[PDB]
Design a protein around this ligand. Structure first.
Ligand SMILES: Nc1cc(COc2c(Cl)cc(C[C@H](N)C(=O)O)cc2Cl)c2oc(-c3ccccc3)nc2c1
Ligand SMILES: *[C@@H]1O[C@H](CO)[C@@H](O[C@@H]2O[C@H](CO)[C@@H](O)[C@H](O)[C@H]2NC(C)=O)[C@H](O)[C@H]1NC(C)=O
Ligand SMILES: *[C@@H]1O[C@H](CO)[C@@H](O[C@@H]2O[C@H](CO)[C@@H](O)[C@H](O)[C@H]2NC(C)=O)[C@H](O)[C@H]1NC(C)=O
Ligand SMILES: *[C@@H]1O[C@H](CO)[C@@H](O[C@@H]2O[C@H](CO)[C@@H](O)[C@H](O)[C@H]2NC(C)=O)[C@H](O)[C@H]1NC(C)=O
Lengths: 470, 464
């Protein structure tokens, strides 16, 4: 303790058989270190590797917002494009990575000579203002998609007269708007223009030849799968929105049947999941199913398309003297100068922003969850059978958080009865799963919930998550 | 001819900069942006953190050169306070704080060395703990062989770290030289009024983690070359350089990556190498890992010295602090340090253990700098080769009290458990040293173990 003697200790430690002991211990330490290094190398080599990264474009990572007419979205007076500059922040709050801005080219009757899509209508605004809107959107990381439906006022939506002129005009305005700076195009009512497949293929070819980050959308009014599939034959990069999804309003398993059939026929490729081309949810559904469809469209494998007023649950039947196609946006209690009391406090964006049980809160949380999560971004989708009226599926990419969505379309409550028995063992759901949210309030959140005692009240949905399992 | 004195002013700077710069800047630079939002607020808050570190470091260097004794942050407390608080601090350091930062840094080095192998999927833990253990064992062997090799390797790795930071800032400035700026010229990105209650103080709290080694070189002193001259010079050379580098690289990070995508990140300082230089990106993360490597050595060094000094006062058993001749290296102390650092490899978590005692260093700096004022009040005649403007120690006391209050208010449960752990360590000293005059059934066994360990390791006690 007080310090052992310096000299005798040094001289005693020289006897053969003990000086070699320290050499043996040092060699043992070094060989143990080498063995542990070799074991670490062996463990590193024998391990699964990262699969890949699909290198997705800009429209794969978020929703899309449709604004058919700026007059109703903004209000009376401020019908110009610059007004959207004051509202883009709101859209950036919704976390929408697109903006399908409606047609702006001049059109006032069924005429063809003086109605052209070369330059903007004078009443809408100015070219410099449109460029200002483009630069403001680019600063805000929002991509503006234009629309070039030649006729939208009359019933004849695509000039059922000779079609060479309109095709030439479209092909001439295309590169014009490309060098203008837009990031996509949309053409609606594709069933009116003759031999649509060849023209769509040509337009897709030119747009994709200009750049690798351009997008083209087509809109059709047919709910038949065969017609849609035949349209998507010649070209494959197309984004096609059709009214095929809805087809219902009193049936629950029909939606699952259509979704699975479409995914199987198209080859598990990229598709747009929308209820219609220029219509919102409340046109085809009652007020008791909006949250279910908002939860379904924000988890299916594709780019979801919503119209304006689809997050506050805007409905056109609840107000009188209101156009069905383009109702005004209920920003606040001052929606109309007259009838002060017909509107309610929960029909405005301000009254729904902070309400926990509002539609807008669910929309914001779902959009934020879809924008960032990789499994929801480009994860594989697998569906399994369930009870009489349950739609349940799994999103899983490689090793991230797996998501399990279960929706109840029935009018009465029933037990879940979850069972797959067919999915690959890689992403088998466990007996214990977490929770994210419920469409209708009255349940717990944030804590694990056992998957065998699951119950579902009528018109409900669950967004459980579970981590990667070995 | 001297026992061990090989640290110059171009070495000490290596030790300080290596200890300061670990994974704080590469891995987690997004806390300040999350708290504040605006790049300007982040820049000014990093500048404020730098100046706070400067005012702390100058006072600590003056205190260290006032009492030129090895084992800083404990020798001052031992000489001012006495035997109980010094033992409490030393025991908690050797138990939970000192051999845990080294393990976490070894783990981060192992993780960011294997990142190119698994760019997306997480690195397996069975292969990430073993690399950390390999690093710790090799560094302990290097330190036990000699001290010259340790100094050379620490200097080389500090140079590599500074070279990597120079490379990243040069690439950022080259991108600045292009036709794209992507900077908030016209308007403010964010105002950052208040997140919940933490308007400003949260940025200060999670802006002082990038620093921390401003105060280590004092754990090594009495082994330096002319300490009275080269310790304050080492601090003055090291600290403003590191704060300027932090601010400038934060500016580069802001001006080369957008706020939205970089805020939602988990393994920052890899996407920077992937986006800009594209192919052969593995030169950015791997080199970063090498950085952490060197830092461990630095810390390891000081750790040994600490346990070399505590046992000098009878606080720790006399078996330690028994150098090995013909190499002049404290073999038992280094072996003890390596073993205690390895002992925490069984903790399956990374959040606990060290997050209970975040307030501990903050209170200990104040507890060791009040000794400055006490010594100035009692014995105002000790030699002082350097003097700074007065009334700064009281300002630093105010800042330290504010910081411990902020840490307690932000998270009181973890701080309470940490207080329970530190307070529960008194029995080991109450019945460990005070219980003298023990019979001959225990002392002889301890002496026998000491002599057999001496024979096994071929060590001799320190000579005067
Ligand atoms: N009471 C206490 C005191 C200190 C000493 O002060 C620091 C040291 Cl010794 C090193 C660093 C890391 C360095 N600043 C970097 O750039 O990563 C921060 C602090 Cl506050 C701790 O360090 C660490 C630490 C350092 C790196 C990884 C994981 C944990 N925990 C500490 C707990
Ligand atoms: C886009 O259309 C172009 C123009 O036809 C296609 O390019 C060629 O088409 C001609 C038709 O005579 C063939 O001779 C060539 O073999 C085609 N070459 C290519 C590039 O395949 C092209 O196939 C279409 N696809 C795209 C997007 O390039
Ligand atoms: C549509 O999905 C069905 C169900 O898998 C497929 O139809 C058969 O599926 C079984 C099992 O996968 C295969 O052994 C048969 O070869 C499939 N027959 C057909 C029609 O190909 C089918 O593969 C999917 N797509 C279609 C209609 O070919
Ligand atoms: C907005 O919240 C009010 C609060 O309940 C809802 O008011 C009910 O309105 C429904 C039909 O809209 C009636 O059946 C109930 O009698 C109303 N209850 C009360 C107490 O007002 C309202 O439904 C909510 N949303 C709508 C559609 O405005």
């Amino acid at each position: 303790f007080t310090g052992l003697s310096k000299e005798e200790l040094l001289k005693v430690a020289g006897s053969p058989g003990w000086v070699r002991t320290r050499w043996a211990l040092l060699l043992l330490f070094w060989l143990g270190w080498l063995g542990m290094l070799a074991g670490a190398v062996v463990i590193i080599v024998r391990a699964p590797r990262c699969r890949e990264l699909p290198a997705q474009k800009w429209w794969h990572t978020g929703a899309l917002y449709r604004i058919g007419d700026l007059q109703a979205f903004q209000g009376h007076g401020a019908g110009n494009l610059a007004g959207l500059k004051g509202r883009l922040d709101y859209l950036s709050s919704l976390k929408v990575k697109g903006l399908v801005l409606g047609p702006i080219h001049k059109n006032q009757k069924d005429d063809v000579a003086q109605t052209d899509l070369l330059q903007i209508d004078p009443n809408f605004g100015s070219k410099e203002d449109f460029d200002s809107l483009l630069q403001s959107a680019k600063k805000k990381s929002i991509r503006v998609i234009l629309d070039l439906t030649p006729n939208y006022r009359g019933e004849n939506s695509w000039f059922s007269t000779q079609v060479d002129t309109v095709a030439t005009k479209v092909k001439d305005a295309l590169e014009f708007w490309l060098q203008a700076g837009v990031d996509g195009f949309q053409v609606r009512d594709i069933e009116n223009l003759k031999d649509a497949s060849s023209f769509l293929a040509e337009w897709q070819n030119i747009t994709k030849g200009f750049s690798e980050d351009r997008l083209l959308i087509a809109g059709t009014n047919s709910s038949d799968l065969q017609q849609i599939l035949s349209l998507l034959e010649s070209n494959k990069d197309l984004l096609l929105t059709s009214s095929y999804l809805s087809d219902s309003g009193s049936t629950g398993e029909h939606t699952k049947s259509l979704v699975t059939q479409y995914l199987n026929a198209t080859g598990n490729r990229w598709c747009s999941w929308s209820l219609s081309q220029a219509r919102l949810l409340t046109s085809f559904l009652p007020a008791q199913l909006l949250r279910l469809y908002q939860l379904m469209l924000f988890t299916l494998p594709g780019t979801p398309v919503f119209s304006y007023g689809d997050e506050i649950g805007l409905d056109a039947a609840a107000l009188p003297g209101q156009p069905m196609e383009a109702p005004v946006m209920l920003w606040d209690e001052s929606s109309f100068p007259d009838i002060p009391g017909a509107v309610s406090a929960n029909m405005t964006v301000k009254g729904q922003s902070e309400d926990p049980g509002s539609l807008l809160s669910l929309f914001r949380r779902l959009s934020d969850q879809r924008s960032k999560e990789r499994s929801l971004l480009h994860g594989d989708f697998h569906a399994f059978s369930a009870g009489p009226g349950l739609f349940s599926y799994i999103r899983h990419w490689d090793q991230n958080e797996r998501f399990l969505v279960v929706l109840n379309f029935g009018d009465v409550g029933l037990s879940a009865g979850l069972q797959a028995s067919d999915l690959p063992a890689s992403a088998s759901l466990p007996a214990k799963a977490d929770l994210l949210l419920s469409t209708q309030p009255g349940r717990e959140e944030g804590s694990p919930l056992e998957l065998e005692r699951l119950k579902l009240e009528p018109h409900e949905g669950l967004l459980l998550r579970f981590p990667y399992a070995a | 001819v001297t026992l061990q004195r090989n640290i110059t002013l171009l070495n000490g700077v290596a030790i300080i900069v290596g200890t300061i710069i670990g994974s704080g800047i590469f891995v987690t630079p997004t806390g300040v942006l999350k708290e504040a939002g605006s790049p300007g607020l982040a820049l000014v808050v990093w500048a404020a953190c730098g100046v706070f570190s400067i005012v702390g470091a100058l006072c600590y260097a003056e205190l260290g050169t006032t009492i030129s004794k090895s084992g800083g942050d404990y020798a001052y407390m031992l000489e001012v306070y006495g035997s109980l608080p010094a033992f409490l601090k030393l025991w908690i350091e050797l138990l939970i704080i000192r051999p845990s930062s080294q393990y976490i840094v070894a783990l981060v080095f192992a993780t960011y060395l294997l990142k190119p192998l698994f760019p997306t999927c997480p690195v397996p833990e069975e292969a990430a703990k073993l690399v950390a253990c390999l690093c710790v064992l090799l560094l302990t062997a290097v330190n036990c062989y000699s001290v010259k090799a340790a100094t050379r390797v620490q200097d080389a790795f500090a140079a590599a770290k500074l070279l990597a930071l120079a490379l990243i800032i040069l690439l950022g400035f080259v991108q600045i030289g292009k036709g794209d700026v992507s900077n908030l010229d016209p308007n403010f990105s964010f105002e950052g009024t208040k997140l919940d209650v933490g308007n400003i103080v949260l940025a200060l709290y999670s802006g002082l983690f990038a620093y921390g080694g401003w105060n280590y070189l004092n754990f090594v002193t009495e082994e330096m070359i002319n300490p009275y001259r080269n310790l304050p010079l080492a601090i003055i050379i090291s600290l403003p350089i590191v704060t300027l580098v932090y601010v400038l690289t934060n500016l580069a990070y802001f001006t080369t990556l957008s706020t939205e995508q970089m805020l939602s990140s988990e393994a920052v300082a890899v996407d920077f190498g992937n986006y800009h230089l594209g192919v052969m990106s593995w030169i950015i993360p791997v080199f970063v890992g090498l950085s952490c490597f060197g830092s461990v050595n630095g810390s390891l060094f000081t750790s040994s010295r600490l346990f070399f000094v505590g046992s000098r006062e009878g606080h720790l058993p006399s078996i330690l602090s028994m150098i090995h001749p013909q190499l002049l290296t404290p073999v038992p102390s280094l072996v003890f340090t390596c073993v205690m650092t390895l002992l925490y490899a069984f903790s399956k978590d990374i959040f606990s253990v060290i997050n209970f005692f975040s307030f501990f260093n903050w209170l200990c700096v104040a507890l060791a700098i009040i000794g400055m004022i006490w010594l100035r009040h009692r014995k105002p005649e000790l030699e002082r080769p350097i003097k700074v403007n007065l009334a700064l120690p009281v300002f630093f006391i105010l800042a330290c009290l504010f910081l411990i209050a902020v840490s307690f208010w932000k998270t009181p449960v973890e701080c309470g458990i940490g207080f329970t752990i530190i307070l529960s360590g008194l029995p080991v000293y109450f019945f460990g040293v005070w219980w003298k005059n023990k019979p001959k059934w225990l002392l002889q066994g301890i002496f026998s173990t000491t002599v057999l360990c001496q024979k096994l390791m071929q060590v001799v006690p320190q000579e005067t």
